[PDB]
Amino acid sequence: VSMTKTSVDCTMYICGDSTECSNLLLQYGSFCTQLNRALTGIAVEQDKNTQEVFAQVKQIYKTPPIKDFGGFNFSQILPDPSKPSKRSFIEDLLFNKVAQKFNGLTVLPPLLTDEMIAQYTSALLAGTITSGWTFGAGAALQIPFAMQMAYRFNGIGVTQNVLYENQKLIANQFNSAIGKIQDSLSSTASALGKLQDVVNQNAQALNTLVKQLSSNFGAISSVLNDILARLDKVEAEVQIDRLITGRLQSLQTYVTQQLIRAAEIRASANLAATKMSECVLGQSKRVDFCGKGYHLMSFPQSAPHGVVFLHVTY
Amino acid sequence: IANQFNSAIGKIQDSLSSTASALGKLQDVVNQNAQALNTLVKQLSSNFGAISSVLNDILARLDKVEAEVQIDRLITGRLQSLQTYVTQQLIRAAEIRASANLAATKMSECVLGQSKRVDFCGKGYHLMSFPQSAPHGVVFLHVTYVPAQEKNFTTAPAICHDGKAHFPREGVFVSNGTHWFVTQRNFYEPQIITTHNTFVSGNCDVVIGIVNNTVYDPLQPELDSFKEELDKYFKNHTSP
Amino acid sequence: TTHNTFVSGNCDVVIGIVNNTVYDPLQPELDSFKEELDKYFKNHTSP
Amino acid sequence: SQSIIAYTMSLGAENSVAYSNNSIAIPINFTISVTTEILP
Numbered sequence: 001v002s003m004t005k006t007s008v009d010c011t012m013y014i015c016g017d018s019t020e021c022s023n024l025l026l027q028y029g030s031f032c033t034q035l036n037r038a039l040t041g042i043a044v045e046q047d048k049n050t051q052e053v054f055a056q057v058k059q060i061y062k063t064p065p066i067k068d069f070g071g072f073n074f075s076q077i078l079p080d081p082s083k084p085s086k087r088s089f090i091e092d093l094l095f096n097k098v099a100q101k102f103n104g105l106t107v108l109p110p111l112l113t114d115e116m117i118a119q120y121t122s123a124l125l126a127g128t129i130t131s132g133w134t135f136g137a138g139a140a141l142q143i144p145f146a147m148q149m150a151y152r153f154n155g156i157g158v159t160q161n162v163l164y165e166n167q168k169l170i171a172n173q174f175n176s177a178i179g180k181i182q183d184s185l186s187s188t189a190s191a192l193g194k195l196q197d198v199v200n201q202n203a204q205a206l207n208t209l210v211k212q213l214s215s216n217f218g219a220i221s222s223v224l225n226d227i228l229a230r231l232d233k234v235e236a237e238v239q240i241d242r243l244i245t246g247r248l249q250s251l252q253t254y255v256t257q258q259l260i261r262a263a264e265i266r267a268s269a270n271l272a273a274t275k276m277s278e279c280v281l282g283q284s285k286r287v288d289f290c291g292k293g294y295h296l297m298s299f300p301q302s303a304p305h306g307v308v309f310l311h312v313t314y
Numbered sequence: 315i316a317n318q319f320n321s322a323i324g325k326i327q328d329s330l331s332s333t334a335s336a337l338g339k340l341q342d343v344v345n346q347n348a349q350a351l352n353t354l355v356k357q358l359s360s361n362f363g364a365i366s367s368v369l370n371d372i373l374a375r376l377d378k379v380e381a382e383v384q385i386d387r388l389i390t391g392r393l394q395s396l397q398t399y400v401t402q403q404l405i406r407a408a409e410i411r412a413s414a415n416l417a418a419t420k421m422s423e424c425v426l427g428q429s430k431r432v433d434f435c436g437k438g439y440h441l442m443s444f445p446q447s448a449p450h451g452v453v454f455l456h457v458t459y460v461p462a463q464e465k466n467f468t469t470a471p472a473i474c475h476d477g478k479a480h481f482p483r484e485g486v487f488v489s490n491g492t493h494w495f496v497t498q499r500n501f502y503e504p505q506i507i508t509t510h511n512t513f514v515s516g517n518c519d520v521v522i523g524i525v526n527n528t529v530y531d532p533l534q535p536e537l538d539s540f541k542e543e544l545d546k547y548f549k550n551h552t553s554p
Numbered sequence: 555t556t557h558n559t560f561v562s563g564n565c566d567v568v569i570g571i572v573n574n575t576v577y578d579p580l581q582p583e584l585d586s587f588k589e590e591l592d593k594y595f596k597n598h599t600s601p
Numbered sequence: 602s603q604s605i606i607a608y609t610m611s612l613g614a615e616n617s618v619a620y621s622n623n624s625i626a627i628p629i630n631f632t633i634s635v636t637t638e639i640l641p
């Protein structure tokens with residue numbers, strides 16, 4: 001759904017507390033005012049991308065604390081009140097499995113923290129179990145959980161009597177699949193590999209920019225303050241413009257690699273927001289879109305940087 | 315329906331007029347491109363490490379050999395400044411394209427017919443949508459049905475009449491709290507539970523929550539209007 | 555039945571059409587009713 | 602009188618629906634709504 005808000009202070013990476021370098025960087029005018037605008041536009045877009053997917057609800061729906069769902073045993077997927085963060089047993093699994101440095105980089109928090117993305121995913125779930133699809137298209141409206149399942153069944157064109165004359169088994173095979181998911185997430189990590197991929201792209205991209213402060217770029221020396229310890233005014237600036245050139249290219253490329261990346265993350269979040277809208281708030285009449293069978297309903301749990309879906313299928 | 319429809323258009327008319335920034339996605343693209351154009355020209359003030367940004371001064375003070383050794387900085391500077399503009403323009407145009415594919419998809423599915431998509435043709439149950447032009451873009455006037463107002467009711471999964479279990483053909487069995495009726499899941503309009511509103515599947519043993527009432531079949535009283543007609547001929551033939 | 559199916563055509567055109575004798579569940583519910591009448595005839599001939 | 606007050610943000614007012622194995626909510630009336638969606 002989103003990346004970390006890595007942002008670079010376009011002066012400090014180029015010029016480590018040096019006005020000598022800053023005045024030569026002013027000889028390029030407004031570039032840094034635009035690179036700062038380019039990384040800022042990514043950071044702004046992460047909040048929006050988190051909001052579009054999770055703020056897909058306009059009230060905080062909640063379960064009653066008594067749990068009469070007809071053996072549909074949601075215990076591990078709703079938040080647990082005893083946890084510090086109000087997160088679920090799936091979310092206590094997920095949240096394990098994925099200030100300015102001398103290089104002038106910075107990192108910022110999301111607008112909504114893990115308490116809040118969890119309260120949103122808790123409402124997206126609680127409207128689902130208390131109110132069917134209807135919270136996506138009007139006021140809240142109570143319905144019994146097995147009657148949700150009845151309506152769903154009739155929706156995929158299996159006749160609603162087929163739910164009723166197997167309910168106590170149906171709900172068990174549903175709980176059996178929930179159980180297999182909790183064991184699976186306890187047993188594996190490569191399944192989360194799509195969230196691992198975004199953070200690793202950003203990890204090696206940061207690591208690349210750091211390595212480039214150690215490059216000589218054809219100059220006498222690769223460090224600015226080491227030059228200020230040894231030259232003066234003309235044979236110094238012939239070196240400072242170079243360091244500036246090589247680092248300026250490092251920023252151009254770094255922000256190019258990130259901007260085309262921020263398009264991957266936006267497109268991925270847009271798809272995730274449509275799957276809040278169409279799997280979780282609804283009932284998909286589209287083949288293989290929500291799950292790999294006929295869709296019955298979908299339940300979202302918060303993850304680091306993203307969302308996992310329990311896509312539930314006949 | 316018509317009064318609500320005409321009020322909704324009449325509200326939208328004023329809403330779009332009144333608040334400061336309601337067309338902000340089109341402000342954003344007419345701003346961002348114009349800001350970059352202004353910037354691309356403003357960069358012709360920068361020295362790029364040369365002696366002036368005003369290129370004719372580099373012929374005026376420097377001559378045929380060394381002027382090249384100034385100029386190469388102005389060339390790589392200006393050309394990097396144009397690369398910075400074109401790379402942004404390629405990215406930001408794909409952001410516009412990625413909208414326009416959503417726009418053409420939304421157009422086809424929300425205007426050229428009726429998508430069942432949830433919150434895709436806007437909030438509520440999509441009814442129909444109307445396309446309007448704007449400079450550089452489109453506005454969709456999405457019309458939808460939204461559940462407004464409701465009463466508290468109780469529902470049966472099924473009805474036990476014959477010990478055999480009866481189920482809706484459509485809709486839901488509900489009680490007003492004394493009697494039971496069959497009604498559509500999105501709007502309250504009851505009927506007496508008939509064999510035409512319902513089908514039979516097995517009996518009340520396997521099924522939870524199932525309620526007790528009789529189901530009416532119009533054959534029974536229709537053929538009682540026929541048994542009485544028969545009984546009048548059977549009695550009356552005693553007489554002639 | 556007459557309540558599980560809808561009528562069409564005549565049985566020549568539809569390739570793959572099988573024969574099978576349908577059930578009209580009105581037909582026994584008017585026969586169970588005809589024999590109630592037949593008992594009132596078998597009574598009314600007697601007095 | 603007005604100042605730049607700061608707070609932890611809110612998502613909505615608490616609304617548990619009063620669910621149970623036999624209760625339902627069916628609407629008597631509806632709005633024909635209209636909304637605008639603007640795409641660049």
Ligand SMILES: *[C@@H]1O[C@H](CO)[C@@H](O[C@@H]2O[C@H](CO)[C@@H](O[C@H]3O[C@H](CO)[C@@H](O)[C@H](O)[C@@H]3O)[C@H](O)[C@H]2NC(C)=O)[C@H](O)[C@H]1NC(C)=O
Pocket residue numbers: 490491492493
């Ligand atoms: C639950 O729904 C029932 C159906 O709407 C309702 O019962 C119905 O009540 C109306 C009057 O409010 C009756 O209408 C008849 O009333 C008298 C009968 O003597 C006459 O003066 C009228 O002309 C008219 O014929 C309906 O006949 C009656 N229907 C049945 C089958 O009983 C209940 O009152 C509703 N329950 C609650 C708690 O409101």
Ligand SMILES: *[C@@H]1O[C@H](CO)[C@@H](O[C@@H]2O[C@H](CO)[C@@H](O[C@H]3O[C@H](CO)[C@@H](O)[C@H](O)[C@@H]3O)[C@H](O)[C@H]2NC(C)=O)[C@H](O)[C@H]1NC(C)=O
Pocket residue numbers: 474477525526
């Ligand atoms: C739903 O309707 C059912 C049918 O009326 C009803 O079950 C019936 O309950 C009566 C009263 O208890 C039973 O009467 C006799 O049953 C046995 C003998 O078979 C005795 O042990 C009892 O003492 C009594 O003499 C009916 O036999 C029984 N009929 C059936 C088909 O089960 C349910 O109780 C109703 N349930 C609700 C919650 O409304």
Ligand SMILES: *[C@@H]1O[C@H](CO)[C@@H](O[C@@H]2O[C@H](CO)[C@@H](O[C@H]3O[C@H](CO)[C@@H](O)[C@H](O)[C@@H]3O)[C@H](O)[C@H]2NC(C)=O)[C@H](O)[C@H]1NC(C)=O
Pocket residue numbers: 572573
């Ligand atoms: C499906 O059932 C159909 C009805 O029984 C049956 O059609 C019947 O086919 C026979 C043989 O062609 C016909 O038999 C008569 O044919 C002529 C008169 O039309 C005479 O020369 C014969 O001696 C004989 O009387 C039936 O008339 C005809 N009936 C109908 C209503 O079409 C199909 O053959 C059956 N098909 C299968 C695969 O079971």
Ligand SMILES: *[C@@H]1O[C@H](CO[C@@H]2O[C@@H](C)[C@@H](O)[C@@H](O)[C@@H]2O)[C@@H](O[C@@H]2O[C@H](CO)[C@@H](O)[C@H](O)[C@H]2NC(C)=O)[C@H](O)[C@H]1NC(C)=O
Pocket residue numbers: 464465466618619
């Ligand atoms: C529909 O009913 C709910 C609650 O159900 C009722 O709750 C008891 C009062 C009792 O009558 C039960 O037998 C019913 O099942 C109503 O929810 C209440 O809403 C008010 C505000 O209007 C709120 O102060 C209460 O806390 C809510 N009570 C509960 C138990 O949730 C709801 O408003 C009713 N709506 C309509 C339109 O009838």
Ligand SMILES: *[C@@H]1O[C@H](CO)[C@@H](O[C@@H]2O[C@H](CO)[C@@H](O)[C@H](O)[C@H]2NC(C)=O)[C@H](O)[C@H]1NC(C)=O
Pocket residue numbers: 073074075076
């Ligand atoms: C719903 O499923 C969970 C398991 O996922 C059940 O939780 C177990 O319940 C027993 C009894 O309290 C405990 O001994 C286990 O340690 C619980 N496990 C967990 C992870 O909580 C829960 O009881 C089930 N409920 C129903 C009605 O079946």
Ligand SMILES: *[C@@H]1O[C@H](CO)[C@@H](O[C@@H]2O[C@H](CO)[C@@H](O)[C@H](O)[C@H]2NC(C)=O)[C@H](O)[C@H]1NC(C)=O
Pocket residue numbers: 317318629630631
């Ligand atoms: C649905 O609600 C609308 C209001 O949004 C109702 O219309 C109003 O009805 C009252 C009388 O009950 C009038 O005084 C108003 O002038 C009406 N306004 C409009 C726009 O017509 C409408 O009657 C309700 N419909 C149903 C069937 O309940």
Ligand SMILES: *[C@@H]1O[C@H](CO)[C@@H](O)[C@H](O)[C@H]1NC(C)=O
Pocket residue numbers: 550551553554
């Ligand atoms: C009885 O039937 C005769 C004809 O058989 C008819 O003339 C007469 O009007 C009928 N009378 C009644 C009371 O139905």
Ligand SMILES: *[C@@H]1O[C@H](CO)[C@@H](O)[C@H](O)[C@H]1NC(C)=O
Pocket residue numbers: 596597600
């Ligand atoms: C004729 O009908 C009467 C009731 O009207 C009944 O008592 C009697 O048993 C019947 N007789 C025969 C022959 O069925």
